[PDB]
Design a protein around this ligand. Structure first.
Ligand SMILES: [Cl-]
Ligand SMILES: [Cl-]
Lengths: 4, 226, 226, 4
């Protein structure tokens, strides 16, 4: 999971 | 009668997908692993809804603005609607080109009722997967389907794509032939809010949840069929 | 159908708190809001017919607004299906005026966050806001029905009340026994956008139009009947 | 009309  | 947008024009409309994966190092932004999964899912989903999909990859901020300007100057007379999907890094009111930030208002302004006459009175949908860290009204007939609430982060999985876009495609595939668009987006809200929780080595980003945010200035109901 | 539609057959529909600010302290430099008592009565009647427990509050200071919301959030809403709060006042983007000055809307709504008002968790919280806007996940199950788009003015007629509240009440009276709430609000958007144009001796405010703005983080469909 |  990564953020934008 | 006057309750639902006319969707029996010869064409449903364009669906412009701006898929930004790779960013210049000077931006400090990292590559958006998983975004190609989103772009592919959207392309197929909107194709099945009979939109003419144009996928654009890795656009600079100049290219984003020019693309939208150009699309806004096409003749949309035979088209029912217009869809634009933005996949990139972002902050509140801002989407990143590969080389830096673009104000969202600059992108949407091309499509205002008094500036793109062949889309006047037709729904203009802007679907945005990005973080949001902090005669007729010109804003009428816009819908912004934001992946997250104002001020919040938005999550993307390197394998599966973004929570919002995967949920949106799933709900369109399942319900576009029978539910009005706001009701489809409401199911997207619930799916995103209930089926996902973040995993991160960074505590700042770990064990978090997300709720998308529907912003509608539509004046009629929208069904993806006639 | 509790999966896709909010449970609205609790013993009570819930509270409808109407904050009606008409008269402002000299220090604020704000003019009196002629027409607002017409909105407050229209709302009180409209929500009474929907079986909400309406509480009309008049001319509250910003401290009083906060304490009211705090106290209301501390009540036991276990037997209530939903919560409604209507704010009638001067405003700017993200801000509503008490009689003695501005307060952040976030301060008002934060009391109702999922983790802060447990007896409202999973139930819809509707904030209906008539004010200008000049410039589980935390916010799940909130709906903001704004009278106008971000950045814009909101108009109020001294005789008939505000365009948005007049239209909202009319559409609830006509459609609440049938339509889902987003669809009622969509008809409100259309009514305000098509049936009103401002008259003012001040050119800045004259011959203008307005489009309301629905911001939904709801996770289910909302019908005011069962 | 007046504005809010
Ligand atoms: Cl990818
Ligand atoms: Cl009055």
């Amino acid at each position: 999971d990564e953020v934008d | 009668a006057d309750n639902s947008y006319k969707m029996d024009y010869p064409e449903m409309g364009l669906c412009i997908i701006i898929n930004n994966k790779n960013f210049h190092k000077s931006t400090g932004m990292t590559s958006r692993s998983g975004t190609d999964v989103d772009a592919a899912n959207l392309r197929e989903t909107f194709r099945n809804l009979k939109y003419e999909v144009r996928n654009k990859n890795d656009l600079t901020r100049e290219e984003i603005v020019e693309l939208m300007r150009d699309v806004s100057k096409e003749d949309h007379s035979k088209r029912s609607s217009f869809v634009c999907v933005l996949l990139s890094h972002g902050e509140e009111g801002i989407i990143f080109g590969t080389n830096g930030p673009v104000d969202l208002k600059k992108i949407t302004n091309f499509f205002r009722g008094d500036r793109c006459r062949s889309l006047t009175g037709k729904p203009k949908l802007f679907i945005i997967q990005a973080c949001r860290g902090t005669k007729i009204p010109v804003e009428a007939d816009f819908l912004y389907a934001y992946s997250t609430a104002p001020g919040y982060y938005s999550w993307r999985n390197s394998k599966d794509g973004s929570w919002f876009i995967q949920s949106l495609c799933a709900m369109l595939k399942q319900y576009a032939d029978k539910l009005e668009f706001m009701h489809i987006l409401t199911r997207v809200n619930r799916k995103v809010a209930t089926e996902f929780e973040s995993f991160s080595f960074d505590a700042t980003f770990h064990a978090k949840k997300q709720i998308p945010c529907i912003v509608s200035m539509l004046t009629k109901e929208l069904y993806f069929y006639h």
